[PDB]
C-alpha cells in the first residue's frame, strides 16, 4: 500500500501496484502530495486505479465520470499520465 | 470480489475482499495499526473496483462551465 | 429539345445568357422534371448555376429518380454549387431515401459538401435502411477525410447499418488507419452484429488489427475524460471548447488537432 495525499487534506490509500497504474506515480516511486489535485478528483483517479488494474487482463463496463469533475479529473490524468 | 472504501476522518483505504467483517477488521490492523455501514455497526453488484461501497466529506467540484452545460 | 438543358448540360454560361435574354424560360422541364439548374448542378457548373438562380430557377425540384439540385451538387463535387443552393434555401433532406445529397457526398469522400450539409441543419446520424449512417458508407468506401470530418462534428461512432456498425464495416476492409480513428472516438469493440459476430472476428488471420482489437483493456482515463467532455457538446459546437479555461495542449486534445 501506499498514501496518496490530495490538496484540501485528505489521505487515499490504496495497493503499490494499483499508483503504479500512474506512470507520473511510478517514476516518483511510502508517501506522495498532491498540492494542485483535489480529494474529489484524486478519489475517483483512485478508483480508476483499481478499475485499470482488475479489467486490464480480460467484457468492460462503463466508467462513470460526472460532468461537473471531467476538466479537472483530465488534468489530473495528464499530470499523472494514466 | 467485493472493492471496498473504508472511510474514517480525513483518511481513505481502498481495498477489495471475498468473508467476514471481523476479519476486515484485520486488514485495516495490518495498514493503521490499531487492534480489532450507512448509519449502522457488500456485493459485485453493490460494490465494484469503479464504484467502491464506503464503509469527513470530500471537496465540492466547482461549477459546470456555461458551455457544457444542455 | 431544348437549347436551356443543353447549354446547361456542359457548362455554356453565355449560350445560357443569351438564351435567356432572347425569352427561353429557366424552369423548364423534361418529362422526366429535369430542369437546367438539375443538369448544371451535375456537372458542378458554378457560372451557370448563379445565372439560372438569378433569373428565378426552383431550387428543389424533384426529378422521376427522386433527385434534387442539391443532391446532382453533391454527386459532381462542387462544393460552391453545394452552398449556393444551401443560401437559396435548397433543402437539406429530400424525402427519397434513393436520394440523400449528404449519404452520396459522404460516399464519394466530398468532405466540404457533407460539412455544409450538416452546418445548415442536416442530421449527420440520419440512419437509411439499405444504406446506414452517411458514417458507414464513408467507412465502407475508405473515404479517410470523410469519416475523420463526421467524427470531429459529434456524429455517432457506433450508428452504422442495421446492427452492423462502423468499426464492423471498418474491419472487413481492415482499414488500420479508420480503425484506429474509430477507436480514438469510441467505438464500441465489443459490439455484436446480425449474424453475431463482433468486429475483431471479421480481420482477416493475418492483420495487427487482432493484436489491436484485442490490445484495446480499458482506456486511458485522458481518453475517458475526452469522451465525456465530447458528450456535452452539440453537432459541430465543440469548437467552444476553445472557451474553457484549459491549457492549449489539451483543447487541441480534446478537439483531436
Ligand atoms: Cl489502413
Redesign the interface.
Known sequence: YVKLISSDGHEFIVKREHALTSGTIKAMLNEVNFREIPSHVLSKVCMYFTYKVRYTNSEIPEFPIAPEIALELLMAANFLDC | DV?L?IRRH???????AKSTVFELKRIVEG?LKRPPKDDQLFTSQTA?????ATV?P????????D???? | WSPMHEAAIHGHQLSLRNLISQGWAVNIITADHVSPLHEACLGGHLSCVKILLKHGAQVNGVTADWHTPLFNACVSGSWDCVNLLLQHGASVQPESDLASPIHEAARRGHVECVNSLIAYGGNIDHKISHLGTPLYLACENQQRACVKKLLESGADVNQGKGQDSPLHAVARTASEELACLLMDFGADTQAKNAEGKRPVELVPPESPLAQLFLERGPPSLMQLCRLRIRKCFGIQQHHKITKLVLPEDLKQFLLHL
Open positions: 472493492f472504501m480525513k483518511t481513505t483505504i481502498f481495498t477489495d495498514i465494484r473496483p469503479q464504484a467502491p469527513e470530500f471537496s465540492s467540484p466547482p461549477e459546470l462551465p458551455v457544457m452545460k444542455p
